[PDB]
């Protein structure tokens, strides 16, 4: 996930949530978004 | 649905069923999935 | 459209939920075509 473009990272966050994928997996995406922002 | 990529069909079915979309729209997706199998 | 990681998570979700077998075959077929058939 560190190698994803910002565009694909954010798109994956929305898609994961919309598809109701595993919540811990969704947390990993959130954590990558937070890492990039900090 | 015939020209949808398999990955857009996968995405569509999860989103449609999780979002409680029209059962007719879900049936269109379910029919195309079965057509492909 | 679906990242490798999203697709694999889709497989885990579909199998967990016991979704229709034709839907599981669709996901499996997309996994294989990406050379992730080793699951």
């Amino acid at each position: 996930m560190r190698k994803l473009s910002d565009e694909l990272l954010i798109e994956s966050y929305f898609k994961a949530t919309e598809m109701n994928l595993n919540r811990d997996f969704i947390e990993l995406i959130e954590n990558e978004i937070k890492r990039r922002s900090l």
Side-chain angles (χ1 to χ4, degrees), chain A residues 1-2 4-6 9-10 12-22 24-33 35-37:
Chain A
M1 258 173 252
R2 299 210 178 182
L4 274 47
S5 67
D6 301 311
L9 176 66
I10 296 299
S12 308
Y13 180 50
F14 282 112
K15 280 189 182 333
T17 302
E18 290 154 3
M19 297 172 69
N20 194 27
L21 305 176
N22 179 263
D24 294 314
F25 171 72
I26 293 168
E27 183 182 326
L28 297 182
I29 299 170
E30 293 174 345
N31 292 166
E32 179 58 22
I33 292 162
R35 189 184 68 87
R36 294 189 189 195
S37 92

